[PDB]
Design an enzyme around this catalytic site. Structure first.
Site, PDB file in Angstrom:
ATOM      1  N   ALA B  33       0.833  -1.193   0.000  1.00 18.64           N
ATOM      2  CA  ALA B  33       0.000   0.000   0.000  1.00 18.64           C
ATOM      3  C   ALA B  33       0.872   1.248   0.000  1.00 18.64           C
ATOM      4  O   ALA B  33       1.734   1.419   0.868  1.00 18.64           O
ATOM      5  CB  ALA B  33      -0.925   0.000   1.214  1.00 18.64           C
ATOM      6  N   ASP B  34       0.645   2.121  -0.974  1.00 18.52           N
ATOM      7  CA  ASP B  34       1.406   3.348  -1.126  1.00 18.52           C
ATOM      8  C   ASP B  34       0.676   4.495  -0.419  1.00 18.52           C
ATOM      9  O   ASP B  34      -0.284   4.276   0.327  1.00 18.52           O
ATOM     10  CB  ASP B  34       1.644   3.622  -2.617  1.00 18.52           C
ATOM     11  CG  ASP B  34       0.359   3.688  -3.415  1.00 18.52           C
ATOM     12  OD1 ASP B  34      -0.727   3.618  -2.802  1.00 18.52           O
ATOM     13  OD2 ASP B  34       0.434   3.810  -4.654  1.00 18.52           O
ATOM     14  N   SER B  35       1.130   5.724  -0.656  1.00 21.45           N
ATOM     15  CA  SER B  35       0.642   6.909   0.036  1.00 21.45           C
ATOM     16  C   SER B  35      -0.881   6.965   0.110  1.00 21.45           C
ATOM     17  O   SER B  35      -1.461   6.891   1.202  1.00 21.45           O
ATOM     18  CB  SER B  35       1.184   8.147  -0.680  1.00 21.45           C
ATOM     19  OG  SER B  35       0.719   9.351  -0.103  1.00 21.45           O
TER      20      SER B  35
END
Lengths: 50, 72, 79, 50
Positions: B33-35
């Site tokens: 999971a990114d930003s």
């Protein structure tokens, strides 16, 4: 030989370009709606906390 | 329960397998999971238990174990 | 007007069927022979009228097919 | 004045709650597409940032 390969390339190119135009547009539409509502939520969050 | 409601939220907000999400599974490197994905994950965690979290204390949370620790 | 080829058949298709190379090629294709680049006469003839021959053989419930490598052949349907 | 502003704060709070729910619901659906587009179709061909 040219008359064969030229045709094959025409068909490949037309299909690829039209299919990507057809799909990517709506994919980006969805991504943009999600981005927009997230941005609104973050602005509301920050203003509420402050 | 809370310790499995956290998994319910994490798996369905990141799309990763239930087996993948262990206590020590970090979101960014393990779950990917990114930003924005992590932002939505924290928002969903807030919604599930109908609570609110401070900005800094929330951003400090970067793992399933940390997620539950702040949740429980 | 009446008594005019277009009433019954497209001009290009009739022109193809009237060619001197058609009987040989039709006999061979029904026999299963594959057509490559080397036999220029037949291959060029197939390229010139491809769509007419495909529409013609469709009456028999068989597809005249062109592989990406440039060779033609016949593939029958179930019917 | 601070009381009067707190009423605005509460309006913003209700708005923020609504937006929060909507954003989460969007993400839940979008997850399926993400798992489905792992075939390397997304990295550049589908996600045309232009």
């Amino acid at each position: 030989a040219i008359r064969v390969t030229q045709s094959d390339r025409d068909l490949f190119k037309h299909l690829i370009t039209e299919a990507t135009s057809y799909v990517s547009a709506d994919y980006m539409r969805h991504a943009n709606e999600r981005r927009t509502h997230l941005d609104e939520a973050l602005a509301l969050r920050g203003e509420l906390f402050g | 329960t809370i310790e499995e409601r956290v998994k319910k939220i994490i798996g369905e907000q990141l799309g990763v397998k239930q087996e993948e999400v262990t206590n020590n599974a970090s979101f960014v490197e393990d779950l990917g999971a990114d930003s924005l994905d992590t932002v939505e994950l924290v928002m969903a965690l807030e919604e599930e238990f109908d609570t609110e979290i401070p900005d800094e204390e929330a951003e400090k949370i970067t793992t399933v174990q940390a997620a539950i620790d702040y949740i429980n | 007007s009446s008594t005019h080829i277009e009433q019954f058949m497209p001009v290009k298709l009739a022109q193809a069927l009237a060619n001197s190379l058609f009987p040989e090629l039709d006999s061979q294709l029904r026999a299963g022979r594959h057509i490559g680049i080397d036999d220029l006469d037949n291959h060029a003839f197939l390229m010139d009228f491809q769509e007419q021959l495909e529409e013609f053989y469709a009456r028999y419930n068989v597809e005249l097919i062109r592989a990406p490598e440039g060779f033609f052949y016949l593939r029958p349907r179930s019917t | 004045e601070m009381e009067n502003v707190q009423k605005k704060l509460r309006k913003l709070e209700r708005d923020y709650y609504q937006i929060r729910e909507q954003v989460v619901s969007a993400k839940a659906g979008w997850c399926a597409v993400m798992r489905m587009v792992k075939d390397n179709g997304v990295e550049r061909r589908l996600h045309r940032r232009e």
